[PDB]
XYZ file of C-alpha atoms in Angstrom:
79
model
C 0.000 0.000 0.000
C 1.097 3.524 0.859
C 4.576 4.227 2.174
C 5.891 6.089 5.196
C 6.157 9.421 3.351
C 2.552 9.535 2.095
C 1.217 11.312 5.189
C 3.816 14.055 4.660
C 1.512 15.340 1.904
C -1.096 16.267 4.532
C 0.939 18.755 6.545
C -1.486 21.082 8.347
C -4.485 19.304 6.774
C -7.140 16.843 7.952
C -7.644 13.257 6.788
C -10.074 10.459 7.636
C -8.671 7.277 9.188
C -10.963 4.304 8.554
C -10.059 1.349 10.781
C -9.836 -1.954 8.902
C -8.618 -5.462 9.686
C -7.693 -6.565 6.124
C -5.993 -4.763 3.225
C -5.144 -1.393 4.802
C -3.586 1.580 3.106
C -1.284 1.900 6.120
C -0.410 -0.334 9.043
C -0.430 2.124 11.951
C 1.086 1.678 15.402
C 0.245 4.315 17.980
C 3.172 5.231 20.222
C 3.949 7.662 23.035
C 7.583 8.212 21.999
C 9.670 8.463 18.838
C 6.948 8.589 16.156
C 7.236 9.132 12.428
C 4.469 11.745 12.711
C 2.534 13.578 15.388
C -1.217 13.408 14.763
C -4.022 15.348 16.415
C -7.216 13.334 16.598
C -10.389 15.249 15.848
C -13.954 14.823 17.023
C -15.326 16.119 13.709
C -15.661 14.320 10.383
C -15.767 17.571 8.405
C -13.228 18.901 5.901
C -11.364 15.584 5.648
C -9.155 15.793 2.551
C -9.124 12.061 1.915
C -9.891 8.642 3.401
C -6.937 6.447 4.388
C -7.611 2.897 5.548
C -5.474 2.088 8.582
C -4.960 -1.209 10.390
C -3.829 -0.762 13.982
C -0.849 -2.993 14.762
C 1.509 -3.573 17.667
C 4.535 -4.795 15.677
C 6.117 -3.968 12.306
C 4.035 -0.957 11.185
C 4.312 1.007 7.985
C 4.223 4.156 10.151
C 4.321 5.124 13.833
C 1.935 7.845 15.003
C 1.939 9.697 18.319
C -1.388 11.206 19.296
C -0.991 14.819 20.441
C -3.462 17.490 21.490
C -1.571 20.514 20.104
C 1.086 20.983 17.415
C 0.564 18.010 15.162
C 1.910 17.251 11.714
C -1.675 16.677 10.533
C -5.174 16.011 11.855
C -7.175 12.813 11.547
C -10.770 11.841 12.259
C -11.096 8.143 13.101
C -14.046 5.913 12.270
């Protein structure tokens, strides 16, 4: 699927993360330290640039995300 750098295209934008179990666009591991990107999670589904299918994993992810409340690389609404 997508590579590590894909999310770099959404600097200061909002995307939609759709949780899947099979065939994701990105395998995502959520971490509290040393992420590839900082993501702010939103409570609103509006103004999402694009839908990215993510599968949450605990080992060997395509990308590591750290949830933050302020100063994120991008925003994501999860469903």
